Structures are given as structure tokens and as C-alpha cells.
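Crash report, auto-generated. Payload:
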Amino acid sequence: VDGASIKFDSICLYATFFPMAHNTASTLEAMLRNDTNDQSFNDYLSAANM
Amino acid sequence: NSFDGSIVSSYLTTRMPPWAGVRQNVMGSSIDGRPVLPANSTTLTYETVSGTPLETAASAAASAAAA
Amino acid sequence: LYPIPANATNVPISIPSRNWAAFRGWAFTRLKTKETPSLGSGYDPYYTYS
Amino acid sequence: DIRGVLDRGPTFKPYSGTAYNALAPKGAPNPCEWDEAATA
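Recovered output after restart:
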């Protein structure tokens, strides 16, 4: 009602890579592609809001 | 200045660093023609984003609120 | 020789890296500029002092 | 990374109190002139 308005101009994604040595990077990739070394997660709240 | 007759450049000079605003201090200009103050000006210490155009006057929003 | 401008008070110098085998010490003195002729060239028309 | 223009409208006001003549008494009127019909 008070006419406070917003206007997005542009958006660019940024990311940062650890300059891992290529041999170690490849070894780490081969490790994490294993079936058993999968990555798990859980939401901190863990809940089902109603 | 009583006609200092010394060699105009006796000290060692250092290669000009290649980036913006260090070659010389002259009244510059924007991309679209706005004047730019010299490199060693005080007013260039901080940053002035100076995005001028706000969003269009939301009179349509006022009418929508009324309706 | 090193130039010392008028009313001055520090003169710094340097020699770039070299080997210093068999060095045997420094020795320095100060001369009036208009009293030192420009040796090394055939004839200096700016040596107006006798 | 997001950049753009944001307008807060007339109602944005981060300072409590006023900005002009803050010391002045709140009832004191500025030097003014006005009309006043009267017959004597």
C-alpha cells in the first residue's frame, strides 16, 4: 500500500574451488564415487511442520 | 625556482604499472560521457554505486490498494 | 659519481648484485658540480669554470 | 550474487525525532503573517 518497490537488475553465481593437486583431486573423486562412501545429510530442525 | 639547472631525471624510474588510473592524473570521463575526477582526487577514496533510477513511481500500486 | 641536488641531505645509492671477491674498501669525497668537467666526451661546452 | 535497485517508499524513517529545529519549542510558530477581518 505504501508503494515501497524493489527491482532486481542482475544475478550471477559465484563459486570457489580449492586448488587441489590433480593427483589428489582425482584420487578423492575416485573415493567419493564409491558405492559405500556416499554422503548423507539431515535437516537441523528435522521436522514436519503443521 | 631560480632556474634549477639539475638533470631533469637523475633518480631511477620504475616501469609504469599496467592498470587503470595510474598512468597520469587527468580529468577523466565515464563510458557514456560523465566527467570523472582525477585519480588522486579525495572523492575517489570510497565507492559511489550511485544507481540513480529507482523503480517506476508505484501510483498503479496506490490505485490497486484503493481498489 | 652521484648527483646531489641543491640543499640536500641524504643521498642514497646502490650497486646491484655482484660478486665482491678481493674487494678492499671504499673511499669517498664530495665535489662542487660546476667544478667537475664532463670527462668521457670529446669536449664539454658546459665546463665554464677554470 | 544479486544487485539491483530498492525503493523504501515514503514511510522509511530510521531516525527518531525530527531533523530540523529539533531544539525549538514544539509550540513556537515561525514568523508569519495572516489576514484577520476586523472593524472598529
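Post-recovery validation: The two ends of chain C are 20 Å apart (CA to CA).
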